[PDB]
Amino acid sequence: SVERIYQKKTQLEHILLRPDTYIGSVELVTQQMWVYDEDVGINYREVTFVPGLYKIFDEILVNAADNKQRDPKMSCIRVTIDPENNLISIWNNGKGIPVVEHKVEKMYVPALIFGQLLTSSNYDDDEKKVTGGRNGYGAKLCNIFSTKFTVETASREYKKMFKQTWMDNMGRAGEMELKPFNGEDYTCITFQPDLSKFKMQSLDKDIVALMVRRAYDIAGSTKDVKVFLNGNKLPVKGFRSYVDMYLKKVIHEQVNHRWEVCLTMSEKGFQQISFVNSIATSKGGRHVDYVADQIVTKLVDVVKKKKAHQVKNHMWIFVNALIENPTFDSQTKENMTLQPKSFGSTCQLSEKFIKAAIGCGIVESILNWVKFKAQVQLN
Amino acid sequence: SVERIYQKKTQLEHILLRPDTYIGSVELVTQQMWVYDEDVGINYREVTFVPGLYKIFDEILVNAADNKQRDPKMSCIRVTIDPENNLISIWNNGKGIPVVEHKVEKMYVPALIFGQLLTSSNYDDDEKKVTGGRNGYGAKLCNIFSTKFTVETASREYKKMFKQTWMDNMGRAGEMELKPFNGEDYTCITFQPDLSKFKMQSLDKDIVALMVRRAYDIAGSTKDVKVFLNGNKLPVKGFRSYVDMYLKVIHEQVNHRWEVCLTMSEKGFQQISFVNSIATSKGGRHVDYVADQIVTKLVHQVKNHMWIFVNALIENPTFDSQTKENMTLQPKSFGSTCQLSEKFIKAAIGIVESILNWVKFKAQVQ
Ligand SMILES: Nc1ncnc2c1ncn2[C@@H]1O[C@H](COP(=O)(O)OP(=O)(O)O)[C@@H](O)[C@H]1O
Ligand SMILES: Nc1ncnc2c1ncn2[C@@H]1O[C@H](COP(=O)(O)OP(=O)(O)O)[C@@H](O)[C@H]1O
Ligand SMILES: [Mg+2]
Ligand SMILES: [Mg+2]
């Protein structure tokens, strides 16, 4: 009775019992957002989907992009989505995971970091890294919310390939397969999400449209990384070309190795599209405020010569950023809360960018509008 | 090298290493919100505070309120805030925690549920409870982020009193003290928050003003519970009187689980709400459920004239984040409904100002 009332849970039990604490809502939500629809392409519409499901997909995708930082020679990511077989796989090149036994934990590294909770190569903050990874949960969460989860990685350096399958919400695992290897390194994560945990029958149009858009995001946000979807190379060559998809006048600057900015006029209020370490910061954050307010200030002062949030409300801004040890207001990670002083870099836009921005069709809209309101009489 | 690169953490290490995942930001934020200032009382202003520090306080306060559901005879909560001694204590009456050894976990229950992670009496969802407690973290998180954390609880039923102190971020514990007991049951949690973890020198005005407001919220959101702050009874007798403090209005206690107040807003849509005594500052489906019901009867422009206050008891509530400012459970799974009476609805009809739309018989001319 005392023993029935007061309980202790294992870590694994707890995640399944309280999923929203780890992956966010396991219920449907409906909201407006950009997705990539088949035949139509990038568009803004109402979408109904489960955040938790999006999240576990996003964890594996971001992990692939994280590997770019670990190994700049990485050049490709391949994504496969198969609704009929309820099957998703995410492949990447560049250095594989060390296929070797961990001397402290007494298991092979891949099995450790995909099969045991609280495991990461990003737990040392002294190293100052710009990965999306930070907590050591992501890959495990995908595993816990999958009926089958397969890890395959190949390490030339250790001359071996590792392959292992987990099943039933990481409740059991198949035998670990090792083989000799000396090819080019790859990692492939293949999983079948547990749709009953998300109250879904299949990977419907909406969730797929989101997942597909993330592939495009990765193509846009990473450097010198080709992205394939299913089989086809995505026609996105860097951030500029990514931004072009959203448009049918645009100002651009690659400020430095960690910041890239595009700006155009908005007629629907302040808009932002942004990324931090290849994470989609859909609700913005201090990184967007940092760049935007810098532009706002300069444009307000030009307007003063002949109003602040009003200037900002005419802006559509696109930001790709690499931030050290980023922080977010929730799981979901839609809003990045780290202060600019801790970013690890600055982003001072060039005078050329600012000058082009003063043109751009913007200070003009505001001035015409303000001249107009002076002409209006209410009768 | 492999072993230095790829690391595994204990649960405890992880919480201290990645606190914001468990308690929210351990950095200052600045935002506008309602607080209770000394001499001035309830007011809306800019506030600078650390959310994580607010949370650990909140966890212990909500736990005290949760005990009401466990024991309806509970009548009192006493809160003590002492900035100088960096000392907070939260006392409640009603049934104490069973002072007895847990047969499976092989320790006394109070030590188990305040000293071990992932421990709760709210893990059975068949029981359909309306507590704020759900995850079995809260009390531990307060302990983990305190230099000293003391649990004292007294159970007539088991004829014993338990007392134990943890120290250094739950890194060590003192000896457990047991004594015979036959008085009236109480539980008192007394802690000193680890201010260095929150980069603070003391419990300043702002955080104290937040904490004090929560005391008032509890007085407002719980039923037949007197609340004391530093020895003074708070003058809040139920939700209506709580709402009045904001307004120096139409009301309905719809049922045992829903209470609603509505007035006009001139500042856009405003909401003040609670789910199981948790402060849902950013709202949720519970506020949408009540509000949209009102809106529909009179029709976003309507909604933007509303200032609504909602106190709800929800079964197994769910939230965006760890700050629990936004409650996400869908109305089908609430465990109750909240159909406002025709009287309320009628009193609500005295916002309707077709007056602005009418007067929008304007002519823009040059
Ligand atoms: N595609 C990949 N390539 C190389 N390493 C990977 C890949 N995916 C995951 N990892 C490694 O395994 C860990 C995955 O853990 P994850 O749970 O995603 O934690 P993190 O918060 O570190 O990203 C990482 O720390 C990383 O070292
Ligand atoms: N004031 C109290 N009176 C009685 N029991 C308490 C009190 N505070 C905490 N508890 C018990 O200890 C547990 C506290 O754990 P907590 O960490 O707050 O998780 P949760 O509240 O989610 O159950 C509760 O489940 C409850 O059984
Ligand atoms: Mg990761
Ligand atoms: Mg609690």
Author numbering:
A (entry chain B): 29 to 276, 287 to 344, 352 to 424
B (entry chain A): 29 to 276, 288 to 338, 354 to 404, 407 to 422
Article passage:
Type II DNA topoisomerases are essential enzymes that catalyze topological rearrangement of double-stranded DNA (dsDNA) to maintain chromosomes in an appropriate state. In particular, DNA gyrase introduces negative supercoils into covalently closed dsDNA molecules using the free energy generated by ATP hydrolysis. The GyrB subunit is comprised of three domains: the N-terminal ATPase domain (GHKL family), the transducer domain, and the C-terminal TOPRIM domain. Here we report the structures of bacterial GyrB43 in complex with (i) the pre-hydrolysis analog ADP⋅BeF3, (ii) the post-hydrolysis ADP⋅Pi and (iii) the product ADP.
Interestingly, also human topoII may undergo a similar structural transition as inferred by the comparison of the respective AMPPNP and ADP⋅SO4 complexes.
